[PDB]
Symmetry: D2
Subunit: 498 residues, 4 copies
């Protein structure tokens, strides 16, 4: 019998676990410590949640180790592991309205979007990776033969073993799912640390693993702080791999911690300052629509968001006029209301950071065309913002906002290489985009952009089958696609002589 925080909202009765999930059971943290999770629509406390301690991490890791080494997960057919993950996906789909509602409460995710993305994509992620289980294959290799004898060389793909997954707050369930689906399809067991400010969909997901029949200890979830819980995961002698999504600065620290303990494997999905180049020969109205999506999607809490838009001189003013027209039509409001287009930012500290960000933008001399401020209403809403006359030396040209702030520079008519160079002049390299009807420009620009993803005449078009990851200080390794599997597998080479 599981304890729940019951809540009647959105024409449903929510049943929300709030405890640590260790070894297949929900339990209090050491000393029954708890913390509050805050609803960004009104600032209220949703409920209290267990606050994991070092000793709780050790319990979770030991559970994950036991489940891997002796438990059923390490013994079943790859095909049957997939069946379990495809059942987990079905269970998530049967509970999708509920999960989207929890996500709306916990993270401020507009409910209609959370059904399609926060939850919908999480469901696709498990189904997609479930199909990979019995299709992960090694090789047989035509090695030189030790004549007069013979040789056979094969490789085996094996799990890495116990993994730690540490994620941010922008899409709590989806970031969990991206990494967990891959981790599990490869046959690993896991300890997951959601962002402290957003534990709820992770904990409801935990309960769903029980309904799906995922063996005890395969999935362990520890709400709590990075510096305590996350840190211990990265130092742990029995953890063999860390999957991390977050800031560059925490990413550096995680990699260092992987190094100093046991050279556990690490992959890093870090920040972005993604450029979007819009040429005069694009479809203008479409550029306005995708341009807006590139910045404002999920209230800008989107690591691949276009962090700079470069717009060709001859269409720049008209582009800005049209963006403003469209911005005025966005309906800011409660994420649970069906007419809402723009929900609140995820938490208070981040709202304050966006306010400071835009003050500094104005100070340094950029033109504030609209927004820039907290919306006058309860909770942590921020007004969709547009800046123009942004010059390359400005702080807002360099720094990741992670909010709904469109940052626009001009480039001269016909000036392709010059704008590319401005677009690449950053230590980030997560995403990028180009709008043009011209095939030669589109191909050339996409060769030249120094980013892990290039969108052409679209934006935010990720997919569970398309690998996603950065270059430079945006990190390394992929989430999604076949390529994601390689972060969660080891290759054993076996060489016979006969």
């Amino acid at each position: 019998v599981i304890n729940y925080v019951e809540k009647a909202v959105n024409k449903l009765t929510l049943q929300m676990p709030y405890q640590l999930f260790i070894g297949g059971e929900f339990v209090d943290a050491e000393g029954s410590k708890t913390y509050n999770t805050i609803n960004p629509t009104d600032g209220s406390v949703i409920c209290q949640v267990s606050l994991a301690q070092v000793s709780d991490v050790d319990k979770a890791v030991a559970a994950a180790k036991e489940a891997f080494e002796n438990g059923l997960w390490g013994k079943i057919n790859a095909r049957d592991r997939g069946r379990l993950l495809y059942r987990l996906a079905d269970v998530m789909e049967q509970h999708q309205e509920e999960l989207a509602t929890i996500e709306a409460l916990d993270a401020g995710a507009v409910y209609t979007l959370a059904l399609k993305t926060h939850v919908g994509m999480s469901i696709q992620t498990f189904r997609y990776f479930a199909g990979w289980c019995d299709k992960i294959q090694g090789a047989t290799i035509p090695i030189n033969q030790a004549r007069p004898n013979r040789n056979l060389t094969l490789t085996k793909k094996e799990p890495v073993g116990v993994c730690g997954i540490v994620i941010p707050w922008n899409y709590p369930l989806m970031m969990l799912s991206w990494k967990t689906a891959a981790c599990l399809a490869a046959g690993n067991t896991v300890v997951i640390k959601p962002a402290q400010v957003t534990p709820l969909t992770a904990l409801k997901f935990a309960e769903l693993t029980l309904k799906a029949g995922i063996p005890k200890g395969v999935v362990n979830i520890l709400p709590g702080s990075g510096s305590l819980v996350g840190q211990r995961l990265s130092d742990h002698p029995d953890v063999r791999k860390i999957g991390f999504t977050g800031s560059t600065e925490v990413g550096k620290h995680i990699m260092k911690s992987c190094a100093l303990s046991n050279v556990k494997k690490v992959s890093l999905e870090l920040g972005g300052k993604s450029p979007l180049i819009i040429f005069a020969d694009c479809d203008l109205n479409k550029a306005v629509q995708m341009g807006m999506s590139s910045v404002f999607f999920n209230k800008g809490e989107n690591s691949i968001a276009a962090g700079r838009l470069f717009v060709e001189e001859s269409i720049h003013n008209q582009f800005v006029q049209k963006v403003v027209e469209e911005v005025e039509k966005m309906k800011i409001g409660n994420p649970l209301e069906r007419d809402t287009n723009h929900g609140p930012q995820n938490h208070e500290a981040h709202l304050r950071k966006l306010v400071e960000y835009c003050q500094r933008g104005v100070k340094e001399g950029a033109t504030l065309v609209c927004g820039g401020n907290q919306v006058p209403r309860p909770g942590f809403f921020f007004q969709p913002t547009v800046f123009t006359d942004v010059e390359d030396h400005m702080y807002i040209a360099k720094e990741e906002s992670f909010g709904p702030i469109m940052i626009i520079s001009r480039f001269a008519d016909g000036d392709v290489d010059a704008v590319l160079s401005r677009a690449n002049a950053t230590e980030f390299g997560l995403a990028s985009g180009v709008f043009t009807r011209d095939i030669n420009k589109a191909l050339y620009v996409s060769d030249k952009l120094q980013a892990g993803t290039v969108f052409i005449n679209t934006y935010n078009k990720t997919d569970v089958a398309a690998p996603f990851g950065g270059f430079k200080q945006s990190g390394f390794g992929k989430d999604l696609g076949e390529a994601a599997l390689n972060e969660y597998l080891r290759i054993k080479t076996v060489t016979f002589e006969y």
Copy 2:
């Protein structure tokens, strides 16, 4: 016009460059600083070698950056990149005797072995990877369609950019070749730091890249210390990937340095304590030959060396008798002499370390059945060594000797899981082996061994097509095989809407 140290030896004339190699030219280090490289056959000084300084590292990195960004290497077809690397392999082949002689002098490599392995496998490496250049391929992916529009998603495999390669001294030319061939085949440029005590074949190799037509700046070589030169490579903001082979402790430090600067990619080939399990049902005579080889190959200076032999009780004593019989037959002496089959250890410090290692084995109660001492002759020769009665708790059961020291334990007849468990009780996981005529035991044991390579009825059987790399604290990433390319490539996802 290049400066050489010239030496008539082994029926040829060695012409050995001795300077740093930067931007296609041989140049003195900052301040014309130099150091001595020492011949382990007689302890003599071979010659003076330039000692790279921080500013030399910066020059080398800048030459590599320019070669990659604006030089010809970043412009030619992948096919033509292949041609250049196939030509470099040819040029190495034309100088095979000279290279192997330099290696005998510099590392004490027995000449006949250096020809086949140190040099022969290096030539194979470049030819293998040259063949990969126009066969490195991305994907097209059946992503969900934004109906009524269409989407196309492809990936492009691109180079990482400037890489640094840091390598040890046991196989100077071969370690360099393993990593450099994969690095260059993937379209990168590189700065290489040979182990300070073994710079000579790296510099000769550098000259050979000129003969081959490799554009200036693509290969740069900096003889110098790990703590100055290697450190700066791992710290440099323009270096994007480090390929490292060496000890676990230095590996941790390299990985930490990569994190703290610019989250440059890293791969790590670290130490081993590889177990070899010998069953009573094996071909015993052949087990003695392969068992001796698993320890003594290349005077034990070999990361995959069997650092522990577990011999089934009923054949143990007979196995020992025969090894002792064969050890007595080994000709220890000058690596250039054709009857030599055991050359000197690589350098004085390491010989000392081996004497100390064997003292500790004796002190702790292991039975020294032969060897254990420096051979009383000039240079740094150490006796082929056999320990028996080795207990799991003993130092020599756990620490990597990196020398010709056979370390033998018994296990009970019919035990399989118990010996596996003892063989797995290490934080190393580089290689391993099993001798048995029994198919079921062979397949089962290779499943259970926690190591990146498992040899069955052979040992030391690496191959340029077979991926090579560790689990646990032996590191991560592969050298050799298709898999090695992945350390040297980035994946860019390109998604169109149309």
Copy 3:
């Protein structure tokens, strides 16, 4: 409303469609023609089934064409096609007892086996290939660049289009499923011709595609004769690919008909005379069990059945003795009786062939140890048969029986190459096996056997992920595995200059 033949049997009420399945509905053939399907347990008529005519083939092909070119199947995401196929597997699972019972009635499949294999593997097949839909990927290739311009080359994996599948009667549903699953997963539409003698599970499967939501016209099923319906499929100008399983001589004719019409693609899964080589050093009791299975599985109605057993002289007589003891324990009976382990042969004409086969065996000088005859009881049962003293020149050493007939020869102790040569002296090359505890012998024999599948210390171990197909006159192309998809895809190369 669908018309059914209703039947109360096996504690179920069977609802069996009996008409042509065309464009998503059950319809009568041209002129309402029908034929009888016969129950092999007692020779009775199960029911009347529509008898497809030429005009019915054309209607089916037209419905497949329309569903491919204009219907929903041609438009949905690969991922959603996957979902439809997974759902189809679920529906099959919900009907598994009914499908196994229908197969028991129609093909004489022993019910408990049909549940596990005939039906159970069919379900696995659809789930497996459902997983492939969104993981079928093309390439991007590093072609030479037309400088100063650039080139991009990619490949797209596309459906072949309208396919015909023609299958035999030994595993009616499973042979349908193997090929149909791969065909549909690749995005094609299909016209299926079951063996005329075994139409029933195919017709039920057709109804299940409706339950699962497969768009109309994607699956069309045509009970009828090979010489009429099969022939027209292979001749049809709008069919682009034939997938065929059956005899070598019909295979040859199908291939010829593909040629003479529109060079439609073809794959051919033909007969087998598969050798099983049993060495003295094998586990003898397991060799008996697996040897039993290799011949008698599914009443020998199994294309990969061992059609010759080669037993090493020193264990030959002992092996035969043990086999006879085991054969005597087999319960022959009605496939619905839970204690039955040997059911009747599929249909009468095949029983007749088996009788003639053994007459000729005895005529030519082989020693008939047991069986060889129809069991005296109603239906078409055949007594499990063992021949010894079989010589290489004998008809029964050459020709496929496709019935429960063990055909044993000796080979001299210590021989390997001689027995290999005898095992390879056949124009067949479908499967093969070796039992030995010796690793070197097992690897060597598996190299030298000229067969598409080699079993080692097991037999009949097929798997939906393991490719299955023949060499030489056993055909070409694979069913099962990733490799099966290649028969049902085309590759388009797209090369840009920009």
Copy 4:
């Protein structure tokens, strides 16, 4: 010593073998039968060439079989097989001027073009496939486990064995090289039948295999007729695969012959009627240059030649004007003159077919804008020809000319599906192209074209790494690229229980 036809021409003394090449020897045909090969520049007899008889085919096949089964080729490492093929490419490169001259004489290949394409791409093909030999890899597959036991399933990629290669006359050396390089790289041995009219580079190539150290019998070359020699190859019981390139009608007969004998594998590269669609928004002067190349390249003797050009209404007349202007500038003449743009047609009967083809185009109502007749001069020259007002029902709109004949239709501005439908209304499907600056048109058109290759803003851009093959009646299977290997390898599945 080998007998040569000796000829002082093009600054060289050509030494041309003229006999059959069987088992590493140049030998006369049965009864010393010969025929004449004709120089198409002046109609003169170059020399007499042996005319292979059936018994000669049988000797070639026996030599290939023996080379495969017991000779060195079947025993050497894959890597060493690669070396021999690289060395063969080196030898071809050292004889490249000589080979190009021979091709100029035998096929009318313009010398400068022959250096770059006929010969140059042949050299690239051998180098490319040489790199594949040690990178052909099988798989290890995570099959369901027969609990309590374990299973290992692996695949081995194996050669098919003795192959027959039958080719046409348009690029005699290159067609040979495309197929043979892939054939040999996969480890097979081969009998090659060159087009009767063009034996000479094939025979010179044979001698080059000797110089390169390709083991006797691996390559056998039999000049002679398709209906005698080609027939017997396709009928032969020891040939296991035919690789065919030629007409659709012969392809059908070849496929039939493979069926009727021993179901040998077959791949088919058949004809083309390839559409090129040129939109008004293309770069027009470039479209004229590439449009001309698309038809006139290699005097139109090019399977992928654009057999119809669809030109958008608003640019049609200007396009035709420019074409005519550029056509008038083409230098027609002796393929040895360095300024020749247009050589003679390959042989007399083909010239006559081209004269008839143009008669018929005028007769049925097409507008002859220029050319259409034999150039009056010695040899077999045909005028570069342009037709306009071509309509979809016309003979010249459906039939492959295989000559320098531009066949132009208009299509209405702003229709796309309508032009596609016209471009797809053929049973051919070898190649196609689209010229447009619009990315959306380019991508959509490339999806919709029913052709194995789509060129975008280029034409004739084949590459040794890019797979090349038809859909529909243009055949199946690929030459070039990784995908070519699959026609020449078999897959053996090996499954263990342990």
